[model samples]
Target: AKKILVTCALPYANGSIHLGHMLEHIQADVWVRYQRMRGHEVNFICADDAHGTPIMLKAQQLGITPEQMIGEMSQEHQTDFAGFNISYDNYHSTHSEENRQLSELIYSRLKENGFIKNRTISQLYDPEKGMFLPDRFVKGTCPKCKSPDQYGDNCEVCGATYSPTELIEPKSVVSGATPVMRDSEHFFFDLPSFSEMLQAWTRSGALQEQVANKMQEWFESGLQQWDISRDAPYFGFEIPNAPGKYFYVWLDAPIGYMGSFKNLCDKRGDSVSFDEYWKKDSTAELYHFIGKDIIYFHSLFWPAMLEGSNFRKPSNLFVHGYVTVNGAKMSKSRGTFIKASTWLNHFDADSLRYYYTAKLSSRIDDIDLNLEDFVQRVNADIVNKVVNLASRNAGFINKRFDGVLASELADPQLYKTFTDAAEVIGEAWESREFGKAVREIMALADLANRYVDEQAPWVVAKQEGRDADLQAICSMGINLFRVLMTYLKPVLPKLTERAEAFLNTELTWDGIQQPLLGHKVNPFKALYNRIDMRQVEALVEASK
Candidate 1:
């Protein structure tokens, strides 16, 4: 077993947790849980990105201090994550003292390494708000495509990047005042100096093939010095000896990964050292799970910062695409952008989790929540194929044999098929190919059901002096059902818990290799209910 530290991208504190946000968390959580079941020492952590102009302005509009606003927002985020059954080792906030100290330390280290420089640059100043606006706080037409209502940093319509000063007719999102160009001294990290290191890391199997190809464009364009300081009135850590300037949100946000782990270590009290996993030559493996949109920050800037600060770079960076609804972007106007709270009110969390795993793969391809397909897939595979096995067999074990399974194997060869299938399923899961794993699991479910049909256990129940034979057949069915549940335990944890109680045993990777014989199981309960179209429709309606 290896020691692994995993993190999901920090969620901003400005909005509610939606289905789109849950995609990354669910994917990472499933992998973390799987590693734990395999007896690996894994620590999974994340934090709320509570800095930046948006949070400051939002707190002002709400008539509260930024501290109070973020405190409340963090609680709500934790609640939403818990409602979805996300098993994070520790969910922290970037605004903590831990993050502040680490951010300062890294910045100081970069400065000492001669990788920091200062230059005067033009910025967009909102006269009405009396402060300089960050990229996200300004809006205008896209400079390249002339698309209206584009953000200051990049265009969502045309996928172009530019400075806020380059925007046409730029307006402050906070005050609606036209922005004017102003000069300010900004600190920049010498990113171009790390080009050789970054290029080697990108090609060293740390990124996916498609992601590496995408990075090639940036490398060709030539890396530039990254601005690391924001002006006053930002909700973040202030740079040491630099009055009226704060560390940019991006600079401090990724450091939250270290801050979160440090916080967890503190809570555990001397059992683990913070330096053990973060030292430059540490042996621990690190993995980061993030959305495709943030690949630039995570893959390029993040590693450069860590290496310059004398910390170990990430072992792997897994990037996933966005979650769309019905082949389009989720839009509030279209009522398809459902929130996590709204989804829980209308449907089970496991249903959505299972549906996502069915579509998720190792590739960075967008997954769609086709509502119609969701209802059908969940009902056919989960309800009809999986749960039906238990419903059909558990009755016989409970009533006829008083919940006691037979000692002898009814079909040893058929049982070997399931154990052999577990090896392939485990491999797919370990490699983060969940879609392939799901397909393999469903195929095994099909084979088990076919075996049950051939035996005709119900027909044997009515035959004279064949009661023992019938018990053994149903016992075999129950054992097969148990194996399938073991494979699915990572994705559908709640269902796994129920299955464990019903079977009176814990489900694990090794347990699949050994079949239960001559054991008594508790009375079976309904594992899951069938999904109805009306329920899914109600969720969308409520989201509206």
Candidate 2:
């Protein structure tokens, strides 16, 4: 077994956790759970990206301090993730003491190594707010693609990159006042100096193909020096010895991964492990799960920061894409935009967890959450296909058989098929081919149901002399259900808990080979129930 550290991108502290956020977390959580089940030592870490111009501006607008606002948002974010059963071992904040210390340490180390540079750069200034505007704090038309309402620094619609000053008719996201290009003394990380190193890393093909292609585009365009400090009145760590200047939120945001781990270690009184995992020579594996929108910053800037600061770079970056609701980007007016909290009010967490896992793959394909399709998929797959195996078979094991399974194998051939599938299924999960894993698992579920159908257990239950046959057939189906649930345990936690209780056995990857026979299994009310169009409509209405 290996030690592994995993993280999802820190949700920005500026808004509610939406399905978009849920998609990434569930993907990471599933993989994390799978690794733990494999008996690996894994630390799942994340944090709130709590320091940013947007955060500061919003706190002011809310008539509160940044700390107070982040406090509320931190609780809210954790609650929503918890509701979804995102098993993060530690959830810290970028505005934390751990983050502050590490941010300064890395910045100082980079400076000492001469990887830091000082230069005066011009950026849009919000005179009304009396501060330099961060890239996200400015909005305008994209200069390259002419896409309207593009944010500063990049165009989400066309994937164009340009300085905020290049934005046509730029206006402050803060006060909607037109911004002026004003010069500020700033610090820059010498990212261009690491271009060759980054190019080699990209060429090594360790990153996702799409990510490598994107990195090639960045390298082809030439890596530029990254501005790593913001003028004061910002809600972030102040740069050491640079009065009135704070580390740019991006600089500290990746470091938040480290900070979160440090906090975890501190809380658990595990001192040596933090350094053991983070040191340049450490053998522990690290992975980051981020959306494709932030690919450039993560693939390029983050690795450069760590290498320059003498910390270990990420083992790999798992990039996923945007979440579309009803075949479109979530629309507030159209009532398709849903928050995590609001969805919890309407649907159980497992439904979305299962659906998203089915949609996810190793590639960075966009996940389209068609509400109507979501309803049908959950009802068909989770309700009818998977859990219904238990619902259809459990009664005989409980009432007619005294909660005791048959003493011997009923259909050893069919049972062997289920056991034989563990290798391919486990490989699919290990390689992050989640969609394929779900498809394979459900295909087996279809077979399990077919096995029950072929034996005519319902028919045999009514016969005079076929009592033993009925017990064996139902027990066979129940054992098959056990196998399927073991494969799905990572994706659907609550359902898995209920399943374990019913089976009276803990589901483990290696434990599946020996089938449950003659064992006394408990009962469940219902493994799952069907969802319909009405719930989706209600979710949309509430979102609007």
Candidate 3:
């Protein structure tokens, strides 16, 4: 069996997990779950990105240490993800003894190989804070775009990119104090020296074509020296050789993948080093799922760092677009910045999963779950089609079949249609085309609904001495439900449990394709009911 190691971007520990974070987590979760169903030895690992200036600043404002802040936040992160059914093999924190040791070892190797160099760079320093301002700590107007509310790296208004020091009237966000330009010694990773190698590696198409092409174009334009170290008052893994200096959050964030694996190894009582997973090729396929905003970091600097440190490069970096709620970015002014926890308080998680799966494609296209679309899609797909299949047909055979398979196949077309549907949708799931997979799966559900109407199993069961026919028709109905449940497993895991109870059989990929013979029919209730439009509105309003 092949081995796989999958990772989603380590979520920032400074804030609560939101819809944007859900997109990445759900994407990775679906793919990892599908891989697991295929019987591969795959490990899904991730961590809370516990380091950075934002963490330190937030901790300071909360009157707690950074360690304390991250510890609390990581617990919340794990809980929220669990609530959403986002299971991780090992959800680790970057602040670990394993990470600290590995970080030092990786840093020492890079320094010995001449990949790391010390340089004094001018940065915005807050006088009151007595520290150099990190990117999130500093805010200012873009000098070129003259746009207010711009961050240190890029302008959301005009897309003009510049360093934090280049911003006009830069001020420290942490203290609201004006920052002055000051020189600080920081470690620089020689990114340009590896630009040729990065360009070559990317051109080999290890990533998606569009990602590789965009990265290659950026490399051709010019690669700058990445500031890998930040001065003190920052919450991160400090450089052992350079006191009061720590690796930038982005610099060490990906290493959390390794740290997580080590955590898993420690639990297993294995002495296996991360090098076997990360440094050796042909051992495991590495894949990363991230939001498009961090594409440059994952595509350029991440791979370059791996190459310089002799770690295995990622086989694929899947980039996804952002999420907008109700035709706009989630903003408090619009009353649409719904918290993940708050959303959970109002509606079922399956509604969001169905909506997201319908809208999300594998490409770099943004998904907007407008209030109306969310209601319509869920009602139309789940209630009207998927759930309606069993609701309409199951009552006819309630406790009638004495664990006997139908002797003659009734509605042969429905059988063929569902079996073909499973195959095609299963192929799409394997290919990571989840949007298409969901569509295909829903098509089968729709076909089943139509078959129920055409066959009218209720009417067929009413005829005297036609019990054999009723048994055959209802047998096909349960089998169809099984197929829908199998295809829906990646998006709706809870459905699997409900389906098992309804069908009275264990669901497997093979079980969905082939119906069980002599399986007892259990009592069926309304699997899903037609939700009122007002109820949907209540969910949205309550979420707000």
Q: Which candidate gets the maximum TM-score versus the true structure?
A: 1
The whole-model C-alpha lDDT of candidate 1 against the native structure comes to 0.90
lDDT of each residue in 1-544, candidate 1, tens digit only: 7989999999999998999999999999889989999999899999999998888888999999999999998999899889889999989999999999999999999999999999999878999888997788899999999998887689998899987778898889888999888999999999888999999987887579989988899999989899999998888999999999999987899999999999999989955568889998888999999998999888889899999999999999888899999899998887799988888888888998999999998889999999999999999999888887888888888999999999988999999988988778989999999999999999989988998899898898889999898889998988998999999999998988888998899998898777889999989668888988898778778878
Among the numbered candidates, top lDDT falls to 2
> How many Å off is the CA of 225 in candidate 1?
1.2
Tens digit per residue, CA lDDT, model 2, 1-544: 8999999999999899999999999999999999999999999999999987778888999999999999999999999999999999999999899999999999999999999999998877888878888788899999998998998699999998988889999888888899887898989999888888888889897899888998888888888998888897888889889899999887899899999999999999987999999999989999999998999998888988899999999999999999999899999999888899999999999999999999989999899998888988999999998888888888988998899999888889989999999999999999999999999999999999998899998799888999899889888988999999999999999999999999999999988898898899997798788888988888888889
- Report, for every candidate in turn, its global Cα lDDT versus the true structure: 0.90, 0.91, 0.79
Q: Name the TM-score of candidate 3.
A: 0.91
Estimated TM-score per prediction?
0.95, 0.94, 0.91
Clash totals in order: 0, 0, 0
Instruction: For candidate 2, give the lDDT of residue 113.
Output: 98
Per-residue lDDT of 1-544 in model 3, one digit per residue for the tens? 7678989999889888888888888888888888888888888999998987767777888999999889998998888888778868999988887788777777787788888988888877899979887676789999987988787789998888888888888888867898998998888888888887777878685577767778867976899878888888777788996888888865678888888998998898877545567764657788888888888988888878877877888888888888898878887655577767766876667777777877777688788978777777888988878877666656665656654557555767767777777667878876768889988887778777777677777787778998887877777776787778777887877666676787777677776556765666577556655556676565557655
Off by over 4 Å in 2: 124-129, 134-181
Error of 3 at 34 (Å): 1.0
Q: How should the candidates be ordered by TM-score, best one leading?
A: 1, 2, 3
